C-alpha cells in the first residue's frame, strides 16, 4: 500500500495507440497527412484514396489488464485527486469498463465522481494546461443529424455552479468565476465535436460556456455535420462520405468537462474558464487517473 500515481499514464499512451489503431480499422476515410520537405523538387504530402465507406462506429467497453511482468494498482481513494501518494490502494487484474469516446470539450459516456465534483490538472497555475473536471451527476445531451443538440437548461446550470465552487483559485474560498467560450482555433477545438452515429458533429456551444458566478426550458445548441475534418490521431486532414440516414440520433451522458483558464490575471478577483479538448490523451486520462503499472517479478 501507500503508493504513488500521477498525471503520467498507465494506458494513456497505450490506449491512445489502441484507439488510434481502432479508428483506422473502422472509420475509413480518404486521408491526407503532411510529411515535411527537404527540397529540390522532392516534397512529400501523402494523400490516400480509400474506398471511403459508410460504416457505423460503435464503442466497445475496453478492459485493460496487466501487461506482462507488471501489475495494475488501482487507487481506491474515492476522491483521488491526480498526483500524490495514494493511501488506500490495491492490485487488480484489469482496470474497469472503459468506454473510449472521442470528442471535445465534453467527456461523454464515462466514469463519474462518486463523492463530489473533482477537478484535475498538471499545474493549476500555468494557464496553458488543461483542467479536467469529473462530474457529480450525469447530464444528457440529445442530438440528431438535423443540426441540433439539446440539453436540459436546469440540469446543466446546476453543474456549472458546482464546478464554480472550486475553480483554479483551488476550491478558492471565493472570487468571481466566469465561464466564456473558446477564443479560437480548429473547428474540432472551438466546438463540441464528436462522432454521432458514424457522422461528425460540430456543435456550437457558446450557450454552455457564457455565464458568471462567484417549464421545460432546454438548451438548444446549433450543430453541424462536416465531412472534411482535421485529424485528432496525427496532424492531418480527412474527408468522409455524406450521410445516408435521415435519422442520425444520439443520446450521450456528459460525464465531464475539459477546461482552460484565461491568464494575465493571476490570483486577482476573477477567473475566466473556457471549454477545451483536443488531446485525446486527456480523454483517456480521466478514466485511467486512478491506475498505474508497476513491475512485478
Amino acid at each position: 500500500t501507500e503508493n504513488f500515481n500521477m498525471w503520467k499514464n498507465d494506458m494513456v499512451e497505450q490506449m491512445h495507440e489502441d484507439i488510434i489503431s481502432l479508428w483506422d480499422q473502422s472509420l475509413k476515410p480518404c486521408v491526407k497527412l503532411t510529411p515535411l520537405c527537404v527540397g529540390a523538387g522532392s516534397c512529400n504530402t501523402s494523400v490516400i484514396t480509400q474506398a471511403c465507406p459508410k460504416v457505423s462506429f460503435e464503442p466497445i467497453p475496453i478492459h485493460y489488464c496487466a501487461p506482462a511482468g507488471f501489475a495494475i494498482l488501482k487507487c481506491n481513494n474515492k476522491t483521488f485527486n491526480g498526483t500524490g501518494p495514494c493511501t488506500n490502494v490495491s492490485t487488480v487484474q484489469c482496470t474497469h469498463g472503459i468506454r473510449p469516446v472521442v470528442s471535445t470539450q465534453l467527456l461523454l459516456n464515462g466514469s463519474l465522481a462518486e463523492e463530489e465534483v473533482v477537478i484535475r490538472s498538471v499545474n493549476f497555475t500555468d494557464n496553458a494546461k488543461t483542467i479536467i473536471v469529473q462530474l457529480n451527476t450525469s447530464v444528457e445531451i440529445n442530438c440528431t443529424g438535423a443540426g441540433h443538440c439539446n440539453i436540459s437548461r436546469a440540469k446543466w446550470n446546476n453543474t456549472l455552479k458546482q464546478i464554480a465552487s472550486k475553480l483554479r483559485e483551488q476550491f478558492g474560498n471565493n472570487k468571481t468565476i466566469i465561464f466564456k467560450q473558446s477564443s479560437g482555433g480548429d473547428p474540432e477545438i472551438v466546438t463540441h465535436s464528436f462522432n454521432c452515429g458514424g457522422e461528425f458533429f460540430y456543435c456550437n456551444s457558446t450557450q454552455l460556456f457564457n455565464s458568471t458566478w462567484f417549464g421545460s426550458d432546454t438548451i438548444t445548441l446549433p450543430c453541424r455535420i462536416k465531412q472534411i475534418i482535421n485529424m485528432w490521431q496525427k496532424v492531418g486532414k480527412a474527408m468522409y462520405a455524406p450521410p445516408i440516414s435521415g435519422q442520425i440520433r444520439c443520446s450521450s451522458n456528459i460525464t465531464g468537462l475539459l477546461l482552460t483558464r484565461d491568464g494575465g490575471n493571476s490570483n486577482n478577483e476573477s477567473e475566466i474558464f473556457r471549454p477545451g479538448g483536443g488531446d485525446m490523451r486527456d480523454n483517456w486520462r480521466s478514466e485511467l487517473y486512478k491506475y498505474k503499472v508497476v513491475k512485478i517479478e
Partner: antibody, heavy 128, light 110 residues
Framework: QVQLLESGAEVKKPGSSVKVSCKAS????????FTWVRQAPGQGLEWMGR????????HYAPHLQGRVTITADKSTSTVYLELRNLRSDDTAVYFC?????????????????????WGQGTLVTVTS | ELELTQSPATLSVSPGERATLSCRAS??????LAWYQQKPGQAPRLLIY???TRATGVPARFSGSGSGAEFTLTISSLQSEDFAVYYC???????????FGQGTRLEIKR
C-alpha cells in the same frame, strides 16, 4: 454560378505536352470541384479526371493515369490539364466542367459527381 | 469500370410528340446517373442528376426515372430546341472512375 472560359486551340506534334487552362469566375473557386471531359471529332464524351479543389487531390481515369495531370491554382481561380506523350488519338476538344460542393471553411462537401458548368471547349489537334 | 450503354442509337420522332431514351449499366450505379444534352458544336447541358432531379432551368418536359442499372429519360412535348444528342453518365464508384454512354441521337422525323 461560375463562368468557365478556356484557352484557345492547340496544334501539337505527337510526343509533345499540352497544358490547357480554365479560368473560373463568379463564385468562390474552392467550393467547387472541376473535371475535364474530352470529345473526339465524331465520338462522344469521355471522363479524363477530376480535382477536389479544396484538398488539391485529383483522381484520374484508369487509361490516362500516368500521362494526365490536373491542377488548380487557387490564386488565379484556374484549373489546368497537362497531357503528355501526345498520341495522334488524343486529338479532341477538351472541356473543363464543375459543380458546387459547399466547403470554404465549413467542412461540408457533397462530392457531387455530375457536372453543372462547362466551358466553350479547347480544340487540341495532334498531328505530324 | 462501369460500362454504360444507351439503347436506341438514333431516335426518330415527329416534333411535338413524346420521346423516351434508355441508359443501361453493366454494374449497379445506384441513382448516381446524369443526363446531358449536346447541340452540335456546343458544350453539354446538364439536364438531370441523381437519376431524377432536374437542373436549374430545365423544363418539366424532360424527366428522369430509374435506378440500379437501367435508366430512362422522357421528353413529353418535343419542341425544336430539344434537337440534340443525349448522354448518360454514372458516378457511383470511388475512387472516381465516372463514365459516359455513347449517346442517343434525337432527330426530327418527317
Amino acid at each position: 454560378q461560375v463562368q468557365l472560359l478556356e484557352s484557345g486551340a492547340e496544334v501539337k506534334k505527337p510526343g509533345s505536352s499540352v497544358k490547357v487552362s480554365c479560368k473560373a469566375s463568379g463564385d468562390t473557386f474552392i467550393r467547387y470541384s472541376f473535371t475535364w471531359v474530352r470529345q473526339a471529332p465524331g465520338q462522344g464524351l469521355e471522363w479524363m479526371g477530376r480535382i477536389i479543389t479544396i484538398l488539391d487531390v485529383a483522381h484520374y481515369a484508369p487509361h490516362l493515369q500516368g500521362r494526365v495531370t490536373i491542377t488548380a491554382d487557387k490564386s488565379t481561380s484556374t484549373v489546368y490539364l497537362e497531357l503528355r506523350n501526345l498520341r495522334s488519338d488524343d486529338t479532341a476538344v477538351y472541356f473543363c466542367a464543375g459543380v458546387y460542393e459547399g466547403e470554404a471553411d465549413e467542412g461540408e462537401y457533397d462530392n457531387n459527381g455530375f457536372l453543372k458548368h462547362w466551358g466553350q471547349g479547347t480544340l487540341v489537334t495532334v498531328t505530324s | 469500370e462501369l460500362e454504360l450503354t444507351q439503347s436506341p442509337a438514333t431516335l426518330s420522332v415527329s416534333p411535338g410528340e413524346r420521346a423516351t431514351l434508355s441508359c443501361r449499366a453493366s454494374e449497379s450505379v445506384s441513382s448516381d446517373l446524369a443526363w446531358y444534352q449536346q447541340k452540335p458544336g456546343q458544350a453539354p447541358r446538364l439536364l438531370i442528376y441523381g437519376a431524377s432531379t432536374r437542373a436549374t432551368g430545365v423544363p418539366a418536359r424532360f424527366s428522369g426515372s430509374g435506378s440500379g442499372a437501367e435508366f430512362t429519360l422522357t421528353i413529353s412535348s418535343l419542341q425544336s430546341e430539344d434537337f440534340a444528342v443525349y448522354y448518360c453518365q454514372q458516378y457511383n464508384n470511388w475512387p472516381p472512375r465516372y463514365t459516359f454512354g455513347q449517346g442517343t441521337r434525337l432527330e426530327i422525323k418527317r
